[PDB]
């Protein structure tokens, strides 16, 4: 039951590794999963609902990875506090490199991803500027850009950059230097009065 | 001749304003332009070779108004000197944000594209690091992340946030607000030493 769902799951994000979406049929994903075609069927409509579960899941371990930070204080000096937010998405997403790049791929085709996104980037960037907001409340930051401008394009700035990290793009950061890279432009950027 | 050209290339932009390029046909192309589809074939071998050259007409022309910027000093200070290189890309890919999107959607589907883009992006942010570190060469700003890598997650922000801007996405900055956002990000991460 959910085990062969979980098996289906497996399956597409251990194929999604070697190969694109548009390259994986459900009778790949069937046989995988040591199930038939019809089968399949019974748990999910499509392959591209398949994707859909992944994303959802590893999103939904980023944002309770968030949350878990922030209900714990955490106890360091302020550009540490915001490496430690950027590296939620730095492992949660580097721990599903395949999902996550396919994620991005199917926004274009999907109305259900995009939205999906789209909903979470609106919560991360909501959280952000709430944090920075924070920070100027308190008197540690400078009241420069509108915070929620500010946030989107931060948070834009990772989605791209960790991406192209993650897909090996050229060009990119290497991966094992685009975290000190974010965080950088992040504390600057929040804490700079120019 | 070369004018039937000129009118298969507005014609393609003009179309690519309402829909994508998958929802427009060769024919649709042919009819625009006052020929028909066989005499298309003359002038591209395909509509992927259409937006192509319209791309890189794109991309060449806010390479040249960066040269052109370059070749000339430019009278003003830093943060005014980073919002002019940065508008170039503002204006220009905001005159054509229809082939600007396309080619975007395009980088996954083919690889004369996604080279096009890399190319161009490896010379800009290669342009970027060589003022930078011009930059911290006459002491105006200090020795931080590497230059390279801090071009290249700058250059990737401005990717991805205008394209967003531009698309309209949700999440975005408005258009009327994301030059100011941008050149904030620029020159705190430039010239702040944290
Ligand atoms: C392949 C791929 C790789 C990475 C992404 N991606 N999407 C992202 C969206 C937001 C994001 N955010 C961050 O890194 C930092 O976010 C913080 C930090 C501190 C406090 C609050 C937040 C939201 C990183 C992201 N990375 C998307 C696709
Ligand atoms: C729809 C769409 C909209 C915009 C882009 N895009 N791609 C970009 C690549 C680089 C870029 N760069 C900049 O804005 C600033 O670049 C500077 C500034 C000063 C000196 C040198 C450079 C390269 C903007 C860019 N905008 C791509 C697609």
């Known amino acids: ?106 926004r274009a085709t999907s109305v259900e991803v995009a939205e999906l996104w789209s909903t979470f980037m609106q919560k991360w960037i909501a959280y952000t500027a709430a944090v920075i907001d924070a920070e100027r409340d308190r008197g540690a930051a400078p009241r420069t850009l509108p915070a929620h401008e500010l946030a989107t394009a931060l948070n834009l700035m990772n989605e791209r950059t960790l991406f192209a990290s993650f897909a090996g793009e050229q060009p990119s950061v290497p991966e094992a230097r685009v975290l000190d890279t974010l965080v950088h432009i992040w504390v600057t950027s929040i804490y700079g009065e120019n």
């Open 1 to 106: 039951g959910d085990d062969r769902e979980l098996a289906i799951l497996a399956t597409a994000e251990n194929l999604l590794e070697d190969r694109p979406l548009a390259d994986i049929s459900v009778d790949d994903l069937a046989k995988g999963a040591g199930i038939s075609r019809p089968t399949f069927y019974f748990y999910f409509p499509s392959k591209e609902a398949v994707l859909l579960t992944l994303l959802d899941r590893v999103v939904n371990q980023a944002d309770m990875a968030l949350q878990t930070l922030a209900e714990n204080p955490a106890d360091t000096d302020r550009e540490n506090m915001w490496r430690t937010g950027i590296n939620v998405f730095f492992e949660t997403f580097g721990s599903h490199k395949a999902v996550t790049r396919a994620g991005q791929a199917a």
